[PDB]
Write an enzyme that holds these catalytic residues in place. Sequence first.
Site, PDB file in Angstrom:
ATOM      1  N   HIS A 170       0.828  -1.217   0.000  1.00 18.79           N
ATOM      2  CA  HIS A 170       0.000   0.000   0.000  1.00 18.79           C
ATOM      3  C   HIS A 170       0.862   1.266   0.000  1.00 18.79           C
ATOM      4  CE1 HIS A 170       0.634  -1.137   4.251  1.00 18.79           C
ATOM      5  NE2 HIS A 170       0.753   0.162   4.444  1.00 18.79           N
ATOM      6  N   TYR A 175      -3.655   3.870   1.867  1.00 15.26           N
ATOM      7  CA  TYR A 175      -4.634   3.392   0.887  1.00 15.26           C
ATOM      8  C   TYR A 175      -3.922   2.417  -0.023  1.00 15.26           C
ATOM      9  CZ  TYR A 175      -7.456   7.041   2.812  1.00 15.26           C
ATOM     10  OH  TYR A 175      -8.168   7.829   3.704  1.00 15.26           O
ATOM     11  N   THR A 176      -4.669   1.448  -0.541  1.00 15.46           N
ATOM     12  CA  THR A 176      -4.081   0.332  -1.261  1.00 15.46           C
ATOM     13  C   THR A 176      -4.435   0.474  -2.724  1.00 15.46           C
ATOM     14  OG1 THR A 176      -4.449  -0.995   0.720  1.00 15.46           O
ATOM     15  CG2 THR A 176      -3.971  -2.209  -1.328  1.00 15.46           C
ATOM     16  N   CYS A 222      -8.795  -9.169   5.078  1.00 11.28           N
ATOM     17  CA  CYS A 222      -8.688  -7.723   5.152  1.00 11.28           C
ATOM     18  C   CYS A 222     -10.070  -7.129   5.336  1.00 11.28           C
ATOM     19  CB  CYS A 222      -8.048  -7.162   3.885  1.00 11.28           C
ATOM     20  SG  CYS A 222      -7.738  -5.380   4.042  1.00 11.28           S
TER      21      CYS A 222
HETATM   22  C1  LIG Z   1      -2.856  -0.896   5.505  1.00  9.62           C
HETATM   23  C2  LIG Z   1      -4.191  -0.186   5.300  1.00  9.62           C
HETATM   24  C3  LIG Z   1      -4.650   0.036   3.996  1.00  9.62           C
HETATM   25  C4  LIG Z   1      -5.896   0.711   3.798  1.00  9.62           C
HETATM   26  N1  LIG Z   1      -6.332   0.875   2.473  1.00  9.62           N
HETATM   27  C5  LIG Z   1      -7.580   1.456   2.280  1.00  9.62           C
HETATM   28  C6  LIG Z   1      -8.147   1.598   0.944  1.00  9.62           C
HETATM   29  O1  LIG Z   1      -7.475   1.104  -0.163  1.00  9.62           O
HETATM   30  N2  LIG Z   1      -9.347   2.189   0.758  1.00  9.62           N
HETATM   31  C7  LIG Z   1     -10.019   2.672   1.843  1.00  9.62           C
HETATM   32  O2  LIG Z   1     -11.212   3.299   1.669  1.00  9.62           O
HETATM   33  N3  LIG Z   1      -9.524   2.574   3.094  1.00  9.62           N
HETATM   34  C8  LIG Z   1      -8.301   1.971   3.339  1.00  9.62           C
HETATM   35  N4  LIG Z   1      -7.879   1.838   4.645  1.00  9.62           N
HETATM   36  C9  LIG Z   1      -8.442   2.790   5.609  1.00  9.62           C
HETATM   37  C10 LIG Z   1      -7.856   4.187   5.590  1.00  9.62           C
HETATM   38  O3  LIG Z   1      -6.527   4.134   5.971  1.00  9.62           O
HETATM   39  C11 LIG Z   1      -8.567   5.133   6.556  1.00  9.62           C
HETATM   40  O4  LIG Z   1      -8.577   4.600   7.829  1.00  9.62           O
HETATM   41  C12 LIG Z   1      -9.997   5.478   6.116  1.00  9.62           C
HETATM   42  O5  LIG Z   1      -9.970   6.123   4.898  1.00  9.62           O
HETATM   43  C13 LIG Z   1     -10.658   6.417   7.107  1.00  9.62           C
HETATM   44  O6  LIG Z   1      -9.834   7.488   7.457  1.00  9.62           O
HETATM   45  P1  LIG Z   1     -10.464   8.879   7.757  1.00  9.62           P
HETATM   46  O7  LIG Z   1      -9.374   9.899   7.949  1.00  9.62           O
HETATM   47  O8  LIG Z   1     -11.314   9.381   6.632  1.00  9.62           O
HETATM   48  O9  LIG Z   1     -11.314   8.644   9.043  1.00  9.62           O
HETATM   49  P2  LIG Z   1     -10.919   8.928  10.545  1.00  9.62           P
HETATM   50  O10 LIG Z   1     -11.110  10.400  10.844  1.00  9.62           O
HETATM   51  O11 LIG Z   1      -9.534   8.550  10.881  1.00  9.62           O
HETATM   52  O12 LIG Z   1     -11.760   7.993  11.485  1.00  9.62           O
HETATM   53  C14 LIG Z   1     -13.116   7.857  11.395  1.00  9.62           C
HETATM   54  C15 LIG Z   1     -13.585   6.475  11.692  1.00  9.62           C
HETATM   55  O13 LIG Z   1     -14.822   6.565  12.316  1.00  9.62           O
HETATM   56  C16 LIG Z   1     -15.727   5.810  11.576  1.00  9.62           C
HETATM   57  N5  LIG Z   1     -16.621   6.684  10.849  1.00  9.62           N
HETATM   58  C17 LIG Z   1     -16.513   8.021  10.702  1.00  9.62           C
HETATM   59  N6  LIG Z   1     -17.537   8.462   9.958  1.00  9.62           N
HETATM   60  C18 LIG Z   1     -18.334   7.351   9.611  1.00  9.62           C
HETATM   61  C19 LIG Z   1     -19.541   7.173   8.836  1.00  9.62           C
HETATM   62  N7  LIG Z   1     -20.167   8.264   8.235  1.00  9.62           N
HETATM   63  N8  LIG Z   1     -20.063   5.923   8.694  1.00  9.62           N
HETATM   64  C20 LIG Z   1     -19.472   4.866   9.267  1.00  9.62           C
HETATM   65  N9  LIG Z   1     -18.333   4.981  10.001  1.00  9.62           N
HETATM   66  C21 LIG Z   1     -17.756   6.237  10.172  1.00  9.62           C
HETATM   67  C22 LIG Z   1     -14.883   4.967  10.663  1.00  9.62           C
HETATM   68  O14 LIG Z   1     -14.496   3.808  11.338  1.00  9.62           O
HETATM   69  C23 LIG Z   1     -13.773   5.758  10.433  1.00  9.62           C
HETATM   70  O15 LIG Z   1     -12.597   4.972  10.155  1.00  9.62           O
HETATM   71  C24 LIG Z   1      -6.663   1.126   4.858  1.00  9.62           C
HETATM   72  C25 LIG Z   1      -6.193   0.871   6.200  1.00  9.62           C
HETATM   73  C26 LIG Z   1      -4.979   0.226   6.394  1.00  9.62           C
HETATM   74  C27 LIG Z   1      -4.500  -0.008   7.850  1.00  9.62           C
HETATM   75  N1  LIG Z   2      -5.002  -3.378   6.541  1.00 10.86           N
HETATM   76  C1  LIG Z   2      -5.324  -3.121   5.195  1.00 10.86           C
HETATM   77  O1  LIG Z   2      -4.497  -3.377   4.284  1.00 10.86           O
HETATM   78  C2  LIG Z   2      -6.704  -2.552   4.811  1.00 10.86           C
HETATM   79  C3  LIG Z   2      -7.036  -2.232   3.497  1.00 10.86           C
HETATM   80  C4  LIG Z   2      -8.293  -1.760   3.199  1.00 10.86           C
HETATM   81  C5  LIG Z   2      -9.245  -1.625   4.281  1.00 10.86           C
HETATM   82  N2  LIG Z   2      -8.926  -1.942   5.491  1.00 10.86           N
HETATM   83  C6  LIG Z   2      -9.909  -1.810   6.561  1.00 10.86           C
HETATM   84  O2  LIG Z   2     -11.124  -2.443   6.159  1.00 10.86           O
HETATM   85  C7  LIG Z   2     -12.196  -1.749   6.828  1.00 10.86           C
HETATM   86  C8  LIG Z   2     -13.221  -1.376   5.865  1.00 10.86           C
HETATM   87  O3  LIG Z   2     -14.275  -0.666   6.447  1.00 10.86           O
HETATM   88  P1  LIG Z   2     -15.708  -0.527   5.777  1.00 10.86           P
HETATM   89  O4  LIG Z   2     -16.274   0.788   6.226  1.00 10.86           O
HETATM   90  O5  LIG Z   2     -15.612  -0.512   4.285  1.00 10.86           O
HETATM   91  O6  LIG Z   2     -16.515  -1.762   6.334  1.00 10.86           O
HETATM   92  P2  LIG Z   2     -18.012  -1.854   6.748  1.00 10.86           P
HETATM   93  O7  LIG Z   2     -18.318  -1.091   7.969  1.00 10.86           O
HETATM   94  O8  LIG Z   2     -18.885  -1.390   5.693  1.00 10.86           O
HETATM   95  O9  LIG Z   2     -18.247  -3.380   7.042  1.00 10.86           O
HETATM   96  C9  LIG Z   2     -18.033  -4.334   6.014  1.00 10.86           C
HETATM   97  C10 LIG Z   2     -18.176  -5.729   6.456  1.00 10.86           C
HETATM   98  O10 LIG Z   2     -17.292  -5.921   7.503  1.00 10.86           O
HETATM   99  C11 LIG Z   2     -17.890  -6.840   8.423  1.00 10.86           C
HETATM  100  N3  LIG Z   2     -17.977  -6.255   9.751  1.00 10.86           N
HETATM  101  C12 LIG Z   2     -18.146  -4.974  10.057  1.00 10.86           C
HETATM  102  N4  LIG Z   2     -18.223  -4.837  11.414  1.00 10.86           N
HETATM  103  C13 LIG Z   2     -18.116  -6.124  11.968  1.00 10.86           C
HETATM  104  C14 LIG Z   2     -18.132  -6.650  13.296  1.00 10.86           C
HETATM  105  N5  LIG Z   2     -18.296  -5.746  14.406  1.00 10.86           N
HETATM  106  N6  LIG Z   2     -18.002  -7.976  13.495  1.00 10.86           N
HETATM  107  C15 LIG Z   2     -17.854  -8.813  12.471  1.00 10.86           C
HETATM  108  N7  LIG Z   2     -17.838  -8.364  11.205  1.00 10.86           N
HETATM  109  C16 LIG Z   2     -17.970  -7.013  10.952  1.00 10.86           C
HETATM  110  C17 LIG Z   2     -19.238  -7.107   7.909  1.00 10.86           C
HETATM  111  O11 LIG Z   2     -19.245  -8.293   7.156  1.00 10.86           O
HETATM  112  C18 LIG Z   2     -19.498  -5.945   7.083  1.00 10.86           C
HETATM  113  O12 LIG Z   2     -20.483  -6.172   6.112  1.00 10.86           O
HETATM  114  C19 LIG Z   2     -11.607  -0.594   7.528  1.00 10.86           C
HETATM  115  O13 LIG Z   2     -11.441  -0.906   8.892  1.00 10.86           O
HETATM  116  C20 LIG Z   2     -10.292  -0.418   6.888  1.00 10.86           C
HETATM  117  O14 LIG Z   2      -9.372   0.164   7.681  1.00 10.86           O
HETATM  118  C21 LIG Z   2      -7.684  -2.414   5.799  1.00 10.86           C
END
Ligand SMILES: Cc1cc2nc3c(=O)[nH]c(=O)nc-3n(C[C@H](O)[C@H](O)[C@H](O)COP(=O)(O)OP(=O)(O)OC[C@H]3O[C@@H](n4cnc5c(N)ncnc54)[C@H](O)[C@@H]3O)c2cc1C
Ligand SMILES: NC(=O)c1ccc[n+]([C@@H]2O[C@H](COP(=O)([O-])OP(=O)(O)OC[C@H]3O[C@@H](n4cnc5c(N)ncnc54)[C@H](O)[C@@H]3O)[C@@H](O)[C@H]2O)c1
EC number: 1.6.2.2
Length: 271
Positions: free
Chosen positions: A48, A64-65, A244
Site C-alpha cells: 500500500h 490506501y491500497t 482484510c
Molecule cells: C494498511 C491499510 C490500507 C488501507 N487501504 C484502504 C483503501 O485502499 N481504501 C479505503 O477506503 N480505506 C483503506 N484503509 C483505511 C484508511 O486508511 C482510513 O482509515 C480510512 O480512509 C478512514 O480514514 P479517515 O481519515 O477518513 O477517518 P478517521 O477520521 O480517521 O476515522 C473515522 C472512523 O470513524 C468511523 N466513521 C466516521 N464516519 C463514519 C460514517 N459516516 N459511517 C461509518 N463509520 C464512520 C470509521 O471507522 C472511520 O474509520 C486502509 C487501512 C490500512 C490499515
Molecule cells: N489493513 C489493510 O491493508 C486494509 C485495506 C483496506 C481496508 N482496510 C480496513 O477495512 C475496513 C473497511 O471498512 P468498511 O467501512 O468498508 O466496512 P463496513 O463497515 O462497511 O463493514 C463491512 C463488512 O465488515 C464486516 N464487519 C463490520 N463490522 C463487523 C463486526 N463488528 N463484526 C464482524 N464483522 C464485521 C461485515 O461483514 C461488514 O459487512 C476498515 O477498517 C479499513 O481500515 C484495511
Amino acid sequence: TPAITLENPDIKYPLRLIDKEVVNHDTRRFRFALPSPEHILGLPVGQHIYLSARIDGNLVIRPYTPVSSDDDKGFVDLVIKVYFKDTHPKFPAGGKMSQYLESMKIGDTIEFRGPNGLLVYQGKGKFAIRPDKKSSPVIKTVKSVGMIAGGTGITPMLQVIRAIMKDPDDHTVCHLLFANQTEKDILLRPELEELRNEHSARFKLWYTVDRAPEAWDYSQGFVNEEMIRDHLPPPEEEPLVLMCGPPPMIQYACLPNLERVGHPKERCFAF
Ligand SMILES: Cc1cc2nc3c(=O)[nH]c(=O)nc-3n(C[C@H](O)[C@H](O)[C@H](O)COP(=O)(O)OP(=O)(O)OC[C@H]3O[C@@H](n4cnc5c(N)ncnc54)[C@H](O)[C@@H]3O)c2cc1C
Ligand SMILES: NC(=O)c1ccc[n+]([C@@H]2O[C@H](COP(=O)([O-])OP(=O)(O)OC[C@H]3O[C@@H](n4cnc5c(N)ncnc54)[C@H](O)[C@@H]3O)[C@@H](O)[C@H]2O)c1
C-alpha cells in the site's frame, strides 16, 4: 524498466488528481497522475501507499491500497470509501482524510509515500511474507489462496487477483468471500463478476451481506463457519488465507471460524 515514482519510502511525492469515478453511494475511484505518462508507481503487488495532509490544523496520514499496478503507466488508482459527516450517530464528524479527498478538485495535489506492507505477491503462486517489520520475508508458494474481504478490504485482494489473472501461466486459484453491509455496498461488483465470467477456473466468487435483498442467492450475515468451510479451499489443500476488513471482522468473524474449520495460524495473513 520504466521510471519509478516511489524511489524511497520516506520521500513524499505530490500527485495531481486527474479523475474520479463514483463506485457507489459512498465509495469512489480516485485516479492520480504519475510524474510523467511513462512513469510507473513502483508497487510490489500487495503493498500500500500513504497519503498525508494537514487537515483542520492536524497532521493526517492514512494508508490506501492501490488497485492499479506497475503495468499501468502514468497513473495510480485508489478506491476509497468516504465517511460523511452528520450520518452515523457514533461518528458525527465523519472521517478526516476521506472527506478531504472527496472535497478535492481535479488538478489538486496530495502527497504520496510508500510502498509498504508485509506481503508481496511475486507471481505464479509465490508470496513473500515478513513475520513483522524487522524480519526477512518467508517465501510461501501455494496452489490456491482464500481471500476474506470486508468493505474496502477488497482493495489488496483485487491487486492480487488482477496480478494472477493477467498471467496465463499463473495457475493459482483464488477463492474470494466478500462481505458488505447491503447489496448496494458491494464494491466493484461488475469488475468482480467480469473476472468470474472470464476466469472461472482460477476465480471463485461469493458474497455475504449484513442485510439481504428479497431475491438473494448468496450468503447473509457476518462471516461465519459455514461460509469459510464452503467458499474457501479446504485446509487439506494447504491454501494461504488472506484477510482484510474491519478489525472486529478479523478478530471475531474470521479468526475463530478459520480455527473451527481447521486452517492453521501459519497459513493465515491479515493485511
Ligand atoms: C494498511 C491499510 C490500507 C488501507 N487501504 C484502504 C483503501 O485502499 N481504501 C479505503 O477506503 N480505506 C483503506 N484503509 C483505511 C484508511 O486508511 C482510513 O482509515 C480510512 O480512509 C478512514 O480514514 P479517515 O481519515 O477518513 O477517518 P478517521 O477520521 O480517521 O476515522 C473515522 C472512523 O470513524 C468511523 N466513521 C466516521 N464516519 C463514519 C460514517 N459516516 N459511517 C461509518 N463509520 C464512520 C470509521 O471507522 C472511520 O474509520 C486502509 C487501512 C490500512 C490499515
Ligand atoms: N489493513 C489493510 O491493508 C486494509 C485495506 C483496506 C481496508 N482496510 C480496513 O477495512 C475496513 C473497511 O471498512 P468498511 O467501512 O468498508 O466496512 P463496513 O463497515 O462497511 O463493514 C463491512 C463488512 O465488515 C464486516 N464487519 C463490520 N463490522 C463487523 C463486526 N463488528 N463484526 C464482524 N464483522 C464485521 C461485515 O461483514 C461488514 O459487512 C476498515 O477498517 C479499513 O481500515 C484495511
